[PDB]
């Protein structure tokens, strides 16, 4: 019945789409932020990809490595790993029912499944652990087991950190929520089914080339979060 | 000593960078064009990737398939394949010394290696070969076996189908060549070493975000060649 | 009900399991045999994977390359083919044969992989590998070359074997029992002229 | 010169090949054994690949999944670890141990893969798989559990075996000869408690 938003700080918000977008539960689990880096320059994507931004040539080129691909592996040594943990949430209210991971489950006793994937790669230089650098990305995947809702459409502005509800009868604003950190994901949970909300939407010969070029720029976001440059794309 | 340009018609030009960019050899081998398609809509990239352009949402999303990945494989059947043939050219003059492929070499008797890769996938619907659709991409890779030249820099304009030489002493135009078809690749062959020429170049806080966003749009080209929409990227 | 048999020379024979073993049809498609080679002896497979042998060492060990992953870059050429030959179930009669260039007007899907090293300056071949296997959707003794009331013999060694029935398609072939199963689970024969592995 | 031996319980012993076989050091790193499991019997490997067995069928056949490719999506959890434990060559003495969270202040690189199925509603584990192998850069009888003048016995079964010498690191272990090599080229033992495959 509600809306789930995954921000870059690694947190999960949940809004009741009627009337207010009034927050119904926040879930902060310490897990870090959704993207990290120590150390032209390399820009991590939310997926796990890295991109090389040459500042001298004004170019962005794909490095042929991933955080995972680096783990497959001169002078340095690669460490790190990929993890999958699932949080059994009680939608709604709250809450954590369990935290399931590789070494064990952590249960509380008393319908929303929330999986965090985390990929870390740390480059260390022998004969020591002085860490020459690292990259670490993460994201949430969501499942419920018991478009947009009728009367109201839900959109998401990446560059504005805003979720918004518009009436299909007027297009006008019904409610709005501003977040204090960049948005990485957004799901609309409705009548049992989980529905992913796109971050990239605009709606109301050599013509269609511009239309398709207009489309290709519309489908990439480059943001900054607490000093970390990252890259969202489709 | 010269410059090699691979166009979308599947041809290979070669220019003497001094003084003129005067063409020295054209190589037309029937092999088709560098990208083809029969049949929202799907846009092939030069690599082999496909992209889905939703015209209603003004969005470009990655399909999780490649021309090769489709071959790995309901109602339809996939056929096609990937081929690697090498043309032993005589740089310079001309020419073909041999054409080496899977089933055999085709020799002439009397220093430039030119490999064409070709990826085709055809979707056919049983019980017949009426071909529900197809995609076919190709590209050239170049090797010589016996930046830019001194005094002169070589650049390439994708959207203008132009190769250009500029003096390092003034930045001014030394010579220029206009092609009649979109450019897919460009190599600068100099003193034994083969040097790939980038298709994307411009040269002369929240600041660097725009600088890096300016960079990320600079590194993608969406063109059209004889009706076929394609996509160049880094 | 029909019995389709993929031989290791590239041709496809069909038998009637109606207490005959008689051949109703047999198809040769000029793509070559399922295994080819050239001039530390190494052995390929149906896949095609690659394996390295020496008679002094006790072992057979994987080479970190495949025919395919060699195409992804001495000069290497070749490629991969996916061709489906449409048959009418009984007595063959190819209806459509669609390859990469286009379709010519029970379907046998023929995969072929080929890599050859050639002299950069000359073009002269240094060595090669060609691997293929059949797939076609609508008890055999691999020791010798027979399918078994009734039996049937080849020329050439067997590669794959399916049994059609009613429309459905069926292919067929303490820790001691476990290890014993692993033993008789890989096959290494000869063709011609060359060692080949049939995996599992 | 040193002899480093990776046992199948996760610990690493070193022997002096100076006509002793004596243990100079031995390292246990709490990451678990190299193979774990849970409750059509299937068998994993060091990689870790997965294989399916039934005592009625003559065979051992690949399942189209790995511990890793199951992580890439009953509910599945777990992950993959890459940890390198820096040792001083003789007598161990771990200098640095860098995992994904950070480095704590001859290097053993420990890979671990883990997948477990859990009940969606409950969280209760349904089954799991854990696979690990050691790698560390700066004649053994796998039949029994010994390395051979002098010999040495384990508890537990052997997984990998290297021989250090002068600085360099060396690990060691008609068509009849070919097929014979393929035979004694895979190992299927028991631990504990579970069948495991050591590939090649
Ligand atoms: W480095
Ligand atoms: W379709
Ligand atoms: W060689
Ligand atoms: W099950």
Author numbering:
A (entry chain B), B (entry chain B): 104 to 142, 152 to 185, 190 to 226, 235 to 270, 303 to 360, 371 to 400
C (entry chain A), D (entry chain A): 104 to 142, 152 to 185, 192 to 223, 236 to 268, 311 to 320, 330 to 354, 374 to 400
Authors' description from the paper:
The unfolded protein response is an important cell signaling system that detects the accumulation of misfolded proteins within the endoplasmic reticulum (ER) and carries out a cellular response that attempts to rectify the imbalance. There are three sensor/transducer proteins: Ire1, PERK, and Atf6, that are critical for initiating mammalian UPR cell signaling and give rise to three separate branches of the response. All three proteins have a luminal sensor/transducer domain that in concert with BiP is vital for sensing ER stress, an ER transmembrane region, and a cytosolic domain that propagates the UPR signal (Bertolotti et al, 2000; Schröder & Kaufman, 2005; Ron & Walter, 2007; Zhang & Kaufman, 2008). In an attempt to shed new light upon the mechanism of UPR activation and to rationalize the differences between Ire1 luminal domain structures, we determined the crystal structures of PERK luminal domains in two different states: one state is the previously characterized dimer arrangement as seen with Ire1, and the other state is a novel tetramer arrangement.
An optimized human PERK luminal domain construct encompassing residues 105–403 was expressed and purified with cleavable N-terminal His-tag in E. coli. To overcome this, we used a tungsten-derivatized multi-anomalous dispersion (MAD) dataset which yielded a good quality electron density map, from which we were able to build the structure of human PERK luminal domain, and subsequently used this as a molecular replacement model for the mouse PERK luminal domain. The human PERK luminal domain structure forms a ring-type tetramer architecture. The individual monomers are arranged along a twofold rotation axis forming two sets of dimers A–B and C–D. Each dimer presents an inward-facing concave surface that intimately locks together at both ends to create a space in the center of the ring tetramer (Fig1A and B). There are substantial contacts between monomers within the tetramer interface, with the key feature being a helix swapped between monomers; such secondary structure swap motifs are indicative of a transient interface (Ali et al, 2006; Czabotar et al, 2013; Tan et al, 2014). The salient feature of the tetramer interface is the α2 helix being swapped between opposing monomers that results in a total of 2,500 Å of solvent-accessible surface being buried, making this interface more substantial than the dimerization interface. The interface comprises predominantly hydrophobic interactions with a number of hydrogen bonds that also contribute to the interface between monomers. The electrostatic potential of α2 helix is positive while that of the cleft is negative.
